[PDB]
Amino acid sequence: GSHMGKDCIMHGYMSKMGNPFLTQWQRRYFYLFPNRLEWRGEGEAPQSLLTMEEIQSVEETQIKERKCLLLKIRGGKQFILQCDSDPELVQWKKELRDAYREAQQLVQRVPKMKNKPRS
């Protein structure tokens, strides 16, 4: 109620993409918001605006010691998180996890066509 919020939580360079064909990753600039999230960089596109109310579960993978991060969407899509920074992604996740979590717990009380005018 107009007291304290959190706009841009974490921003910077974040590589994410590929899944079925993990041969070459791509570094792109993203922005983890309190609900939204911008994804831009090289190439081009008509739009690149997303939120944080879909992801199914965020986690990181390892390989003998360390691999890369992961970002599975509950929509049916998947993404491979990767960065040169250990914390970066780390922090991204922390803020990300919640981003996806909150969105959930926030979209938890979702009536599947009922309304129920009291009873």
UniProtKB/Swiss-Prot annotation:
Cellular compartments annotated: Cytoplasm; Cell membrane; Postsynapse; Presynapse
Portion held of the full protein: 556 to 670 of 689
Highest taxon, organism lineage: Eukaryota
PH domain: residues covered: 7-101
Residue(s) carrying Phosphoserine: 119
The family this protein is said to belong to: Belongs to the protein kinase superfamily. AGC Ser/Thr protein kinase family. GPRK subfamily.
Name of the protein in its database record: Beta-adrenergic receptor kinase 1
Organism: Homo sapiens (Human)
Cited function: Specifically phosphorylates the agonist-occupied form of the beta-adrenergic and closely related receptors, probably inducing a desensitization of them. Key regulator of LPAR1 signaling. Competes with RALA for binding to LPAR1 thus affecting the signaling properties of the receptor. Desensitizes LPAR1 and LPAR2 in a phosphorylation-independent manner. Positively regulates ciliary smoothened (SMO)-dependent Hedgehog (Hh) signaling pathway by facilitating the trafficking of SMO into the cilium and the stimulation of SMO activity.
Domain-level remarks: The PH domain binds anionic phospholipids and helps recruiting ADRBK1 from the cytoplasm to plasma membrane close to activated receptors. It mediates binding to G protein beta and gamma subunits, competing with G-alpha subunits and other G-betagamma effectors.
Tissue and organ distribution: Expressed in peripheral blood leukocytes.
Gene that encodes the chain: GRK2
Quaternary context: Interacts with the heterodimer formed by GNB1 and GNG2. Interacts with GIT1. Interacts with, and phosphorylates chemokine-stimulated CCR5. Interacts with ARRB1. Interacts with LPAR1 and LPAR2. Interacts with RALA in response to LPAR1 activation. ADRBK1 and RALA mutually inhibit each other's binding to LPAR1. Interacts with ADRB2.
